[model samples]
Target chain A: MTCDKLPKVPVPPLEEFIKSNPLQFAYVLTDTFDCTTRVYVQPARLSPNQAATALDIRGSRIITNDFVGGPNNSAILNNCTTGEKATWYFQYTNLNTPNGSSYCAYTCNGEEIAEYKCANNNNGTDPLQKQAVEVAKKVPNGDKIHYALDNCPEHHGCFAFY
Target chain B: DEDPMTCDKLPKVPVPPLEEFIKSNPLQFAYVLTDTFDCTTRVYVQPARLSPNQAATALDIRGSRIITNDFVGGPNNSAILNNCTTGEKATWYFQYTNLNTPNGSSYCAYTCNGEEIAEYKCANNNNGTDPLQKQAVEVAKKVPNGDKIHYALDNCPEHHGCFAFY
Candidate 1:
């Protein structure tokens, strides 16, 4: 079977929001050479309004402390609200990095918003999780990217991105 | 299952005995797959030939011995072989013969570990031996340095005279 034959993850509308405006949510850049990111933001917070004003809103409101640098560094936005659907996204960058690098990242809804938090809010944790997402998505052409969520319940949190 | 014979269906060709093959030829060669002759590592024996006249061939690994077959014809040229030995003690052979037809028989056969494989039949002409010779030349020159070279052969979807190997 070819890469296209692999079952698609049904790009939900929420995932669509995160892929376009990665900076607006808590996410992790899965690549240093590409613009794919795993974002941790509430699917509910990903309202059409947020995407419309993502560019205009600056500072802590949109762009947070998340940053990917050097050969191993990952850009991660650790603050976001929780939501219903668990999601992951894949996309290419509009341009390349200064070192001729492109990037890819993943986005999981919520983190500090619930118990599914990156567990320990450490600096290296986000980058590490981002790297794992990168590997998971590095599937063969005939294979597919599989995203598994920890099925968080109401009032109780579960891990979303791994 | 009963079905009418069609142009797409492969012909039947009998596999010769391993003992018959060793006795038929005085000189034998080892086969290998590689990008270059001097490379230290062996590579996959890819892109086996399959022409309108020269039928396609494939190798599927099964346990210790490798199973070989012809594309057009099914089990006629099938054989279980290996690529572990060299020289007279080596377990491999290439043979050809006619089975049933006005065009007569022509083939590229392989055998190893005392087992004979299917014959790769050539169409019309007695050029069956040529394909095996070609494979042998590839082995001699490039000298595959590794064992267990994986390979695959397939026909182009909905197309005739079109084949692919990987």
Candidate 2:
């Protein structure tokens, strides 16, 4: 049995939020990252809204089994309106069989990131769970920028840029 | 009626005259569930066995044993009813252990009847002597009627051990 509905969890942009609620966000980020704030932000902010394109990253595999492969060096292209933080999403889809597939998007500043391991599309087309979007509304008030990661497999997956 | 049953050991139980011993205890019952291996079959029985002079008699059998069978899978491969007694129920617990055989199938069954009960190739590969008796519960059930059910192996070679019951 597989998950019919998408499962989602929210992730917020820490450094940007620290600009506003430095003390509160500090506690939150500390707990999530074991007090070590240095983390690999998802590359969902490289592309501009309205101009985001599909990415094929089947070959650029991520060693998900062991996450200690050091940081990856994938370039992000951002060309959207300045300060308009992008809402990148990661999608997990079933490939008909037991094989599992997932899609991840990244944002840079106010634009969507592209190239560097974008979306995931597996071989063969069988009955698959439709893709759904998760969004991170916006940065906390008085914050210059913010990003969030939300995973909801069974709910809406389309992220509408505001 | 006078009791025809009595218990005796040694010469009275008959230090079987060498000739008689040779004749009564053949090697057949020991090998197969036949009359040939009678020697090995009787070898397990202690000489000083308890006997009731009463007309009614019962054999307290417990424990079990495992043997190997060299058969393929399927109905013929798994636990099957090889034979049955006239009135007694012979139950042998059959279970599937080896599934890696060329043919995929196995089972464990219990055999019981009115008389003597024996367990055999009721399940398994029937190949490579893989028979094992996990247990043998106390049986109030008697041997089948007539000679159909007797306290002896009829037609099977594998005998594990007797169970212990209070």
Candidate 3:
């Protein structure tokens, strides 16, 4: 019925930004430009069914009764309409019975984007930390690790390994 | 004065013909250091060789490694290791001079083992012009902590390229 109460998820870093020649990791915030943003959420109403609903900023709203099964089970969000071009995908879940809110993960074209700490809904702590705790309950896997090396200064006249 | 280019007062080592070295490497550059201050030195010739005064005390060019291929304004201006650990560190220096011949030359020097040392350009004008006369001498002395020193000489024929050693 109402999806406005969706809980935001912790965003992950991009793949390319992590794997550099010298090997390092960095989290870059995502920019919402002309590209489309897809948000996914699992409503609390459908617990056993595990229904994942996708909302696109463009014009499409996707509702899948069975997200884990069926041939087209992967179609969580629809393509961009007339003006909206999809560049980022965000995932969230409302399966947390205690909070009755959704937790999410954001990505840019399948690449994880970084999430900053937010004070969401008087959670006592930062919104990002709260979402991380909720997501950990459902996903179990912790944050993904990435590595890359920073480039040397140009004035030094040394070639960068990556 | 003893001619710097002549082998007198220096080690008498056999050297390959300039043509052989020129033919072997597309790039031609070389330098020699004497065992002592009065030791004679000369212009780096192609296909060259040197035999130190004491065969046991030969030139140790082992640690002379390249640090960077690019320098301030030259594409081939490379930074290199001086490899000055031997006993000859303080008693030797490069003889700088300009050749009236078409080939040009330039050189810079730094002190001790670290690669971050400041550079002192000993010779920057080697663009071949007539009158054709050039001469200068570098002697190592009072090196901090008695550490060895390094030097870079531009290989003008190779277009601002460089050779560096202790």
Candidate 4:
């Protein structure tokens, strides 16, 4: 999910907002880092809005208090929220075969706090699911990142991503 | 492959003679799931264990010995310590840093033929006289580590202190 929908505001306003609501964006950089976060994507039965809500509800809680530093960190208050981070999203895509389309709900930080489904590609076309699966396969079996089969609720659709 | 790995100091578990041992502890078949990471070349053994859950009766199993020559990056190798695989080795390759999760975690996986190597070990063996378990110390240098297999017959008991080469 890109911040394309979020109206572009001047950098100074964002910085001001960060200063007041520091808790929200302080750990944006660190919550998603170069290491130490394990990701597992499950195909679930969901819609674009439902999956978006999942990330919205869960991602915030997961990243709280977890602060990954930034290159911009200096004497000044850190640049808490970037355009993309403001609207961090997963691509709801069908880039994978067999499933045709899916909502790949990727959870992070070795946490299984959220619910996932064998979602389908009813949302739209995005490529993250394909690439995610490719990389996920190369990783050996870890408790957090097992390549579980695409499981759906019923006879029709399975696995949707956003 | 040291002078010899033994369990001399430990008390022996009940062995009902070689004939019964052979039948009770038959070799098992397993499906390959994925690879494992190792730092160096050495032998690893699974303990003599009962098969996995859901068994109404308890069946006996012996050891599964393996050797691995692995590093963090590109090249990696592992093998089962069976007679035919004495000099044999697999690709034992590894890929890292390329496939980081979206959350950015690192895990090492072997790119070798896990299934083929598993079959190789499943078929080959040595007996109580020749002692296949102890031979791994010498043969491990030739063998490279393989991937994860089904646990039922493939996984030996751990923490029971029944390791064959311990």
User: Where is model 4 more than 4 Å wrong at Cα?
Assistant: A1-101, A106-128, A134-162, B1-166
DockQ of each: 0.01, 0.00, 0.00, 0.02
How much does candidate 1 score in TM-score?
0.17
User: TM-score of chain B, per candidate?
Assistant: 0.23, 0.19, 0.20, 0.21
The residue-by-residue lDDT of candidate 4 on B29-125, one tens digit each, is 1212322211111122232356342112112123344433211112112212222234443333222111112322221222223222222121112
What is the per-residue lDDT of model 4 for residues A64-120, given as tens digits with 9 covering 90 to 100?
111222232201111222212222223232323443334333222232212112233
Considering summed lDDT, which 10 consecutive residues are worst modelled in model 3 chain A?
A16-25
lDDT of 2 by residue, A49-112 (tens): 2121111101111101001111232222221112122233222222212342323323333232
lDDT of 4 at B7: 16
Interface RMSD of each: 28.8, 37.2, 35.0, 20.4
lDDT to native, each model: 0.24, 0.20, 0.25, 0.24
Model 2 chain A: worst 10 consecutive residues (lDDT sum): A57-66
The number of clashing residue pairs in each candidate reads: 31, 93, 10, 34
Q: Report the lDDT of model 1 for residue B18.
A: 31
Chain A TM-score, candidate 4? 0.22
B43-146: candidate 3 lDDT, tens digit per residue: 22221135332121112122232221111111222222223242222122123333222454332222223421122223333331213122221221111111
Off by over 4 Å in 2: A1-89, A93-99, A111-121, A124-162, B1-166
If the candidates were sorted by their lDDT against the true structure, best first, what order would they fall in? 3, 1, 4, 2
